[PDB]
Amino acid sequence: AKPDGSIIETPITANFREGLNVLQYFISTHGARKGLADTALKTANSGYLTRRLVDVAQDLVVTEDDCGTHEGIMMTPVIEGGDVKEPLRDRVLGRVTAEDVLKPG
Amino acid sequence: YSYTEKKRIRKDFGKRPQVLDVPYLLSIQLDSFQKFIEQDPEGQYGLEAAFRSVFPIQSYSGNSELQYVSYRLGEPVFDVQECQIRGVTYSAPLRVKLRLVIYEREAPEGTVKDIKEQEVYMGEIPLMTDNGTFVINGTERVIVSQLHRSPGVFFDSDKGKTHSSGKVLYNARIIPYRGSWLDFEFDPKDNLFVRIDRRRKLPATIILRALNYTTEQILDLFFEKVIFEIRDNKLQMELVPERLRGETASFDIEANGKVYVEKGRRITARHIRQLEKDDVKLIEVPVEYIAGKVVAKDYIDESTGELICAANMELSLDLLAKLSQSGHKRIETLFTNDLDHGPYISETLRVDPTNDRLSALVEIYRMMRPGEPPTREAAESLFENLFFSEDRYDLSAVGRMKFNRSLLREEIEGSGILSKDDIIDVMKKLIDIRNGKGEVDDIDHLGNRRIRSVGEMAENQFRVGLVRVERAVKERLSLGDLDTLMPQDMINAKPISAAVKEFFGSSQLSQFMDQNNPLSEITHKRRISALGPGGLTRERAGFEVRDVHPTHYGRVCPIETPEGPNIGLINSLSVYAQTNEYGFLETPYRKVTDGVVTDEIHYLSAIEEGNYVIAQANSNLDEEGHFVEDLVTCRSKGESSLFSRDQVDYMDVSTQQVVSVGASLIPFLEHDDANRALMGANMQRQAVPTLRADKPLVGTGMERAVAVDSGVTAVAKRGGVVQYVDASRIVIKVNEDEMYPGEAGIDIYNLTKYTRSNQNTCINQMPCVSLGEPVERGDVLADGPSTDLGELALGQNMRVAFMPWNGYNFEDSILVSERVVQEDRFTTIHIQELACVSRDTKLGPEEITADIPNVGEAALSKLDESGIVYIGAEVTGGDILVGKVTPKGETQLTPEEKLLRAIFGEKASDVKDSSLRVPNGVSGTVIDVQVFTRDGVEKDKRALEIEEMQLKQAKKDLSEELQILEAGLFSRIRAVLVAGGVEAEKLDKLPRDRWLELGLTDEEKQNQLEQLAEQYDELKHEFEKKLEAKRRKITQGDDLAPGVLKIVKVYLAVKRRIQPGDKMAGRHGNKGVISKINPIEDMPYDENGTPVDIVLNPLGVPSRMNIGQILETHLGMAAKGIGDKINAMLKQQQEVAKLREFIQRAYDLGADVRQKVDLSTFSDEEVMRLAENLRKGMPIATPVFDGAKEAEIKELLKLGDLPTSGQIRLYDGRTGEQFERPVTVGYMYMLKLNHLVDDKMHARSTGSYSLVTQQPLGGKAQFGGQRFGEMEVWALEAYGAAYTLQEMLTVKSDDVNGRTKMYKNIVDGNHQMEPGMPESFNVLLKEIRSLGINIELEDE
Amino acid sequence: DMIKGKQGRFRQNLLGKRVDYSGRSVITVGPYLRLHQCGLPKKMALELFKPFIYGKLELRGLATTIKAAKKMVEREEAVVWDILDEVIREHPVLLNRAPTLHRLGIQAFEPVLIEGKAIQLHPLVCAAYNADFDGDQMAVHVPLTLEAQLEARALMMSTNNILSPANGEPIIVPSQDVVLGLYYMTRDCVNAKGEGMVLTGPKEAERLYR
RNA sequence: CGGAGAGGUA
DNA sequence: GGGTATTCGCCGTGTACCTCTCCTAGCCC
DNA sequence: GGGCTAATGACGGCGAATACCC
């Protein structure tokens, strides 16, 4: 990527095992600089966000073994776009059933 | 050629000769300050411009004017070295010729009296040293150059203002060099709003109302007129073919009498072209189209002059009928279009709540100053001052130039104040940019950003001081006598000197120079900080400004910037970049005439660079100046592209001018990732100078330039033959062709020996010359710290194997051989400075003495009778360095104190101990004691001793000068006395000073004897008065802050040895922590049996993308092999010619390589010196983007009789068996960073606590506990870590009762806790109660 | 203005809420350490566990007063080294990374005394700490009461935190170096020394390779 | 151990 | 009328360490 | 001597107070 994030027309035709042209190394420098600045900025933002999240949920502690609630949430293997991106097993794994599921038919 | 170059030739693998040699790399600082401080024949940057802007001063009444005439810089009372060693500033006094003129009172202009105050003292300005630094409080400080928005016109885009409508808006900002900013921004309603500074928005035309403009004038100035002729039916309109490019067809557009464009159509380019080729002048239009337009001016009746139509209101059928019946033929209506010029000013006038100058001024005064009931005169004065007074709003020359360039004027200069024409131009082009005819200006473009170096900031703050003193003098001239009184009487030294000192000492760009390496110095002085006053802020984010720019190329280094949260703001200037005359950054480029790239250079500025196309330094040049490739890689606006060799306009002067000095030092930079190479360049500046400097085997060639251009290198000011070599002094017998008229004799270079630079690091200069060695001007007489033979010596070359040895080197961890510690290399000298100030208190003045109340004699054993520890004593933490005592206010003894002193036999004193004790955790040897005693304070034994040594040094220098002068004088008097009768016998038989007691026959010879005798006497008085002046300089009191009597600074030297844990890193971004020092036998060994010094993790290369170090290894292994192969040749004492062809072949290896050949050096002595310097490897110069290829490294390996593949099968010296495959072994250049594990370690259990809270903090004798923040509190909360939080927050941190109880419990032999009530919450409770907000406890 | 804080009320937990019996050092790799162990400098152990040394010295009769204990610890003789061994043998300490993004960013280990000047971290645990031995610097915190030691051993000992608390699946995993060694072992060739012969178990396999 | 500014580190 | 649609202030700003300065002064009594 | 003694080149978010077409 170049500044504004668009892809340069001419890629880095060489690599580290051969001489990088002056322009090629300068272009790679833009990506490196953007990555480093992004890491710093996201470090600050993520620190602040986890601060907020700890603030909101500090009081949440499991205090009862059972509540006898028959309401719950539906789990389906997430198919976003046109293909499944997460199987049903993982989201259902580790959970506690809300109603006794049946067989399809 | 250089003589120091002959003593060690560094092989270069560069393939293009350096067309432009590397200029002086501190030229920015020196040029800036010389432009600042030199005399001016015309008003230009410097003290002259500031004075000419602020002076003359006119009083309120009396016509008493204070006029400037000239200024001269007073000779500084001290020179740089004595300024540093005395702890005082290095400043030049400023003195000015002033004339106070009182004119006729009262009559036409004419003077009555003029009084001259010549050379008035108004303060001393700090003076820049030849290096480019400033001494302020005895320390070298650097004014970091600033990058800021250049004053002028900036058309930027306001984004994010959607309001469910999207659309990016525009903004035009006027930036003066001094004064109030101006803002013309747009709104979603396309109404122009004006802000002065950041004050609240006003309609655009209000200032036009304040600028004496009617609605008619405002409408005339911006919008175009449209003709309405009262004729035919429904009126006709004078058609303009270039008026329908954006308009829609809402009326019958006819041509030749027939309608060409019908109503409701979209007017196309075809319609415009048809109307152009028809050349129709007027067209009949419906009256409804007339009613939709807005008249541009008022229209009145012709009989009675009654207003019927007025500007800024739309047309209507009634108004048209009224004007037709009153009598009209020409109607001047406004032009409106939603793509091109639209009714932005018209709607602004409609929204504008004022219609005359007075109301506009009143409103402007009100929104400048809330409250403050406004008067017309006050508003007029404020508006004139903020925009039309040349003492409150100035653009300066660069501001005016950029202002004209932004508005596209041919002028390059103009008035410093804003004008009506300038504002209307800003209006017109901002409306154009809304129309799409203009283009928004980049915000980080180096052509839109400017460099304020030291001179500009100094003159700005000095003009501020001038404004303060002019306020004072204006007050005093009218308050006091209008008659004779000397101008020195009402100009105070406090304002100007205070402002200048504040700038040079406590600014945010006046930084302590990072001084641990010559690279650190040279990067710090070349730093470009976008921060500072008038620029960015650290908390910007900023993603636009942090990012590198296409024009950021070749001016500031893209791979040199801190990793911290200020990346992309603090750059380092490129190697060849320099500030323009106005403050922009310009880079040299070789001009390409037709195809030939000539050696002539042009410093293209950022804006000028974009216009032309720039070819790269790559694509080498064959024949005179033609590129090898017909299609060459170039950059037209910042993007790489292919361009014809006959279509280029400029080319890079060199291949190193796109990186900083720090980045240019990394070899094989074209083989590391930009991130990793950036990191490595960052660690290079943090390298601490090693115990003995040693050349890098694989360098770039900038080592010599960095060493010489830095001030750490003792460079021969004048050439000659070295008369006297010493570890502390270098005395050069200057050549006769470099002598000043008369005689000046020797040139003396005193050597900086073991001085704390800025970072508690030792800097000393190493004499690299010997007696009788012929030297010339510009060569290295003595090697500075981290410099060997005039080449930069940041780190040390080391034997390295790349393989994962038993997982002791796991991520980037580093395995060090015991032989590294055996060689005492990567060992450093650290000099800590400890200052003890003997002050004068209201209870009595403090004293420096060996008598310390109630202390053991063991500590005082190393203390002299003067009260200061000997120079050379080994001291540890807790001992006394300076024996300070403070007069006790009163002697009060607690009964507990009496009980303790009865048992322990303690004494009672009327003076309390306040002596400077060594910090608990450091040790070392006292190497330098500096005593600062101002006038009026009696000298003691130690001060007299240090003064005596300084006097002896100065006397020795002046005495050697006297010896050479008197030797010449005695030679000539003896030659004369031989004439007129031979008398050469008795002079040999008598002392050479007794020849003045011998007479001669009365001749011209006798007269010559007499005149040479009086010359001898005059030289004696010359030496006497020079010695007296030096004695006054060294003996006189130095400047101290009020209240302090003496300042004793003690320097402690610690020999810090490398050990497991120290952060030791390579050039390429390769990092590491020393894992452990395994014995040398445990280290692996090759077939010859040579153990490997360093083991690096091979796993760091396939991820961190720095394989240049791998190449650095291979090219190292060859180079040291060339060093080893000749070393064996040295051991056999082989004949000189053999070494000659060996070195000639070694340097000749390579294709199209510029290094030249021998024998041009001397046949035997110079060849032997070169071989002796080459026994420890052979230095290799590798330009960053023009370095050695793989084939060259393989050839050098082959000449070394070593594996051409670069891998030799080691034997694991730990167990003694070879591995399944050979490993990569070679010599790599490792840097020992200033992140020593000794300085980083700490822990504590019990110690200091704050006086406001019981949190543990304080000093470094026992630093407080480590800051277990809320993040780690959450980390414990995620676990079932519940008690651990309570101990780590209540009993281990705050509860003093808890702390004591738990300490007693653990000492008693159990681990139990008290719950406690932390004092931090008690403090919060108390201060909540302090605001009248109640806190109470619901008691259980 | 100092009621208000950034971030959070200052002196309660940030900024800064410092704590005694804590330290900080650069970290080195110790590849000889068991997963429940860390290498801690001898000087750091001495001046961290000072009250423990005082108590043990006064209990064992090696000192008669707190001043004697101070003299004994500052002299750093060989006698106090056995005392420190006793007090460190079972007593664990918490290692902590300054940017803490999850609970595994602080973990308890058994401190193993090492000569040197830096702390040794288990190679497997650096992934949990998100710490790379590139100059990164760790902190140590010493639990004092029984409850703290028991609780650190039960929950915050690295052996008890072998599974990530965010999504399951283990977080301590051979990363690069042991990975390379294992991969080098388990590779196969088509022809090399000792091919097509028959062996009984790994014993003479080790015998034949080594 | 009262508080600001700068650099470097992670 | 009413719902944007601005304009006017308040506010937030990872972590932790090292080093370094640099610390109410004007003034009429 | 001294005892009183007196700015934007931030950015994004957001609540409060009016602002403006239909």
Side-chain angles (χ1 to χ4, degrees), chain B residues 476-506:
Chain B
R476 189 268 185 275
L477 283 174
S478 187
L479 179 56
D481 295 344
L482 300 179
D483 297 326
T484 62
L485 74 165
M486 294 299 291
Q488 68 187 325
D489 301 337
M490 71 305 298
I491 297 174
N492 201 8
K494 186 75 57 195
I496 290 169
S497 160
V500 171
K501 185 44 152 83
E502 182 65 26
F503 169 53
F504 282 112
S506 301

Side-chain angles (χ1 to χ4, degrees), chain B residues 418-532:
Chain B
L418 201 43
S419 50
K420 300 152 159 297
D421 183 47
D422 293 333
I423 303 155
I424 68 168
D425 294 359
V426 175
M427 291 325 178
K428 288 192 295 189
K429 276 73 70 177
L430 180 67
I431 295 305
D432 289 344
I433 207 172
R434 172 52 58 87
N435 298 343
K437 306 161 178 196
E439 302 294 301
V440 286
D441 302 343
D442 301 332
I443 301 299
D444 310 313
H445 203 215
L446 272 297
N448 297 340
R449 265 145 75 90
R450 199 184 76 84
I451 301 299
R452 275 202 299 268
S453 44
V454 58
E456 291 196 273
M457 321 175 88
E459 67 89 10
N460 286 327
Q461 63 84 30
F462 180 80
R463 194 271 211 181
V464 175
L466 294 174
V467 174
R468 315 186 69 270
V469 73
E470 85 165 0
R471 189 265 294 165
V473 72
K474 278 187 181 292
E475 174 188 76
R476 189 268 185 275
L477 283 174
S478 187
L479 179 56
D481 295 344
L482 300 179
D483 297 326
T484 62
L485 74 165
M486 294 299 291
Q488 68 187 325
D489 301 337
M490 71 305 298
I491 297 174
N492 201 8
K494 186 75 57 195
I496 290 169
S497 160
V500 171
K501 185 44 152 83
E502 182 65 26
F503 169 53
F504 282 112
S506 301
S507 188
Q508 64 179 118
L509 295 185
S510 179
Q511 299 171 355
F512 278 116
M513 198 185 68
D514 205 69
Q515 193 177 24
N516 42 42
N517 287 317
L519 182 62
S520 177
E521 311 205 300
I522 197 163
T523 47
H524 198 275
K525 302 164 227 294
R526 298 190 101 214
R527 192 183 303 284
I528 295 282
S529 186
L531 277 69

Side-chain angles (χ1 to χ4, degrees), chain A residues 28-85:
Chain A
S28 299
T29 314
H30 161 76
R33 288 275 294 280
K34 186 161 76 59
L36 291 158
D38 196 3
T39 52
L41 268 61
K42 295 293 193 285
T43 302
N45 306 334
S46 190
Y48 165 58
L49 181 48
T50 187
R51 159 168 184 67
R52 284 182 288 181
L53 289 164
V54 167
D55 266 359
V56 73
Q58 67 84 25
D59 68 307
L60 203 54
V61 65
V62 175
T63 192
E64 271 205 301
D65 298 331
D66 188 9
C67 71
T69 294
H70 281 122
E71 276 208 292
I73 60 171
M74 291 332 304
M75 321 315 297
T76 51
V78 165
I79 306 163
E80 65 183 1
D83 303 271
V84 64
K85 301 293 176 66

Side-chain angles (χ1 to χ4, degrees), chain B residues 613-752:
Chain B
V613 60
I614 297 89
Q616 282 313 278
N618 296 181
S619 304
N620 313 70
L621 294 172
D622 56 337
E623 196 266 330
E624 54 188 0
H626 304 87
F627 290 91
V628 289
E629 311 177 302
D630 196 1
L631 293 175
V632 55
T633 313
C634 309
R635 35 185 299 275
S636 170
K637 272 78 179 172
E639 63 279 14
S640 179
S641 58
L642 271 300
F643 268 88
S644 285
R645 67 172 68 193
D646 289 351
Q647 295 315 106
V648 295
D649 291 338
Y650 271 118
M651 192 255 298
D652 293 28
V653 288
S654 198
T655 190
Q656 314 167 289
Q657 55 90 31
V658 307
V659 292
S660 52
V661 285
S664 180
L665 285 151
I666 291 167
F668 300 114
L669 189 72
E670 58 183 0
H671 299 285
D672 309 343
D673 191 34
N675 188 330
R676 196 52 44 161
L678 183 147
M679 294 177 71
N682 292 345
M683 283 74 75
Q684 290 194 259
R685 303 186 298 107
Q686 304 143 40
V688 65
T690 315
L691 183 63
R692 45 165 65 238
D694 45 349
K695 58 187 181 294
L697 262 65
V698 183
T700 308
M702 221 65 78
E703 285 82 25
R704 290 203 154 290
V706 165
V708 171
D709 296 358
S710 186
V712 298
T713 298
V715 178
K717 302 193 300 320
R718 287 194 305 168
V721 181
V722 187
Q723 170 174 89
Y724 169 71
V725 180
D726 188 31
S728 306
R729 306 174 55 240
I730 301 299
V731 180
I732 310 297
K733 172 72 178 54
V734 192
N735 286 340
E736 310 310 285
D737 60 311
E738 285 194 333
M739 273 292 169
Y740 323 100
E743 281 162 294
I746 53 163
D747 275 9
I748 175 64
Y749 304 77
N750 294 274
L751 278 298
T752 68

Side-chain angles (χ1 to χ4, degrees), chain B residues 1160-1224:
Chain B
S1160 294
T1161 63
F1162 182 76
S1163 55
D1164 291 331
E1165 181 64 11
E1166 295 188 320
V1167 171
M1168 215 52 57
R1169 262 171 200 292
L1170 190 46
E1172 291 160 44
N1173 281 341
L1174 286 168
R1175 70 187 309 156
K1176 300 180 182 66
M1178 156 180 299
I1180 309 299
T1182 301
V1184 293
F1185 297 156
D1186 193 72
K1189 314 303 190 177
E1190 294 177 354
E1192 319 278 24
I1193 313 160
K1194 293 199 155 73
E1195 294 149 36
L1196 200 66
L1197 294 174
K1198 200 167 62 162
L1199 275 296
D1201 313 303
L1202 295 174
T1204 305
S1205 310
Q1207 301 197 115
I1208 185 169
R1209 53 181 183 77
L1210 273 186
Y1211 283 51
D1212 186 74
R1214 185 72 190 111
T1215 187
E1217 191 181 55
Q1218 60 187 318
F1219 318 122
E1220 198 145 339
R1221 80 179 58 77
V1223 302
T1224 291

Side-chain angles (χ1 to χ4, degrees), chain B residues 804 810 812 1104 1220 1238 1241-1244 1249 1266-1267 1279-1282 1289 1292-1294 1311 1320 1327, chain C residues 2-3 11-12 16-18 20-25 47 96 103 117 134 137 144-145 151 176-177 184:
Chain B
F810 167 64
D812 284 329
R1104 301 197 183 236
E1220 198 145 339
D1238 273 335
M1241 211 176 68
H1242 200 43
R1244 55 153 284 145
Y1249 293 116
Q1266 294 272 1
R1267 203 266 289 281
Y1279 294 115
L1289 292 204
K1292 299 199 296 153
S1293 171
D1294 291 331
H1311 310 75
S1320 289
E1327 162 186 65
Chain C
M2 62 80 71
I3 285 289
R11 187 149 300 151
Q12 304 320 105
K17 195 41 160 281
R18 306 166 168 283
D20 284 342
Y21 302 86
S22 71
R24 172 175 321 265
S25 308
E47 60 97 8
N96 177 8
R103 84 197 189 145
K117 183 62 65 68
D134 306 328
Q137 184 177 182
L144 301 192
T145 193
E151 172 166 0
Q176 65 182 357
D177 186 74
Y184 164 82

